[PDB]
Amino acid sequence: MENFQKVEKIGEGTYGVVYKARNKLTGEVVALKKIVPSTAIREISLLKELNHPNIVKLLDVIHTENKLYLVFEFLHQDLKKFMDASALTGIPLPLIKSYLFQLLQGLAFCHSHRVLHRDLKPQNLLINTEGAIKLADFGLARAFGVPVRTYTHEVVTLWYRAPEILLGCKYYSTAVDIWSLGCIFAEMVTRRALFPGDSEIDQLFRIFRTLGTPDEVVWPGVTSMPDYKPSFPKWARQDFSKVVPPLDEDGRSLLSQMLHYDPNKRISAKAALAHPFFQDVTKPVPHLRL
């Protein structure tokens, strides 16, 4: 670590404090994440080759003193902050579309190498001043788990968790990332989290209250998920026109496919990139004060 000068604390991530740091011998300004089991080291080393322009570059993995430090490319803002800052007029649609579109490319890339994020959230989606948006912390969940509370006891958000994870499916797939990104897409659009659950049950019930309590018709096998209970209330599905109003039909079409209950029906990242929603996609520059 002596090769890094901490510039400022950027935040408290899932696994440890995130610092803006400067690499003393490269001159590079990086994001330094203090997170070691051999399994975690080999997984993490696999992440170093997962390179894609909508994936926050993993510059180096420093394994010293028993201590694990990941050095990432530094972006200048996360999507939560950018949404919070854009709350008054919201993020212009063409920008939403461009981020969604680039996030899907980032997903398609990782998913094609069988790597899931598992923990997508606005805070791990980082934007630059040019209009790019990238996924940070890809593959970390599989390397070190997703805790209930972070190392600061901060509560890990459930707002973006796929229903098959809430239902205790142990073996969930790349569909959980599409679900999360669908939730983030809706939040960009409406400027309100779609499902801000504050407990697993509240999260699940929130889902059900909007999309209908899932049953065997829409999701074969749902009733035999580990945490499914026959006693769950049976809520009717709400129309998507009421759920993300502003959004045009191609947007709502795509979001309902990203939000399919059955993970096998849920649109893949690559099919989502061929959705007519992206027909006029462009790459606008965000209004970004740094």
**Residue 54 to residues 2, 73, 118, 198, Cα–Cα distance (Å):** 29, 12, 16, 30
Residues in contact with ligand CMG, counted by CB under 6 A, come to a total of 16
Tell me how far, at minimum, the Cβ of 70 lies from ligand CMG, in Å: 9
Residues 6 or more apart in contact with residue 223 via CB below 8 angstroms: 215, 216, 230
Give the Cα separation of 47 and 23 in Å (integer).
20
Give the Cα separation of 220 and 208 in Å (integer).
16
Tell me how far, at minimum, the Cβ of 117 lies from ligand CMG, in Å: 13
**Subset of residues 127 to 156 that bind ligand CMG, contact rule: CB under 6 A:** 136
Give the Cα separation of 246 and 189 in Å (integer).
7
Query: 277 with 256: CB under 8 angstroms?
Result: no
Judged by CB under 6 A, the stretch of 73-81, 84-92, 162-170, 215-223 that binds ligand CMG is 73-81
Which amino acid, 180? S
Asked if 72 is part of the footprint of ligand CMG (rule: CB under 6 A), the reply reads yes
What mask, x for binding ligand CMG by CB under 6 A, covers residues 91 to 130? --------------------------------x--x----
Asked if 76 is part of the footprint of ligand CMG (rule: CB under 6 A), the reply reads yes
Asked if 31 is part of the footprint of ligand CMG (rule: CB under 6 A), the reply reads yes
Judged by CB under 6 A, the stretch of 10-18, 163-171, 215-223, 266-274 that binds ligand CMG is 10-18
CA atoms within 13 A on the CB side of 184: 31
Residue 239 annotated as catalytic: no
Q: Is 15 annotated as a binding residue?
A: yes
Pick the binder of ligand CMG from 7, 10, 61, 85 (CB under 6 A): 10
147 token code pair: 């805790």
Instruction: Name the residues annotated as catalytic.
Output: 119
Binding residues for ATP: 10-18, 33, 73-75, 78, 121-124, 137
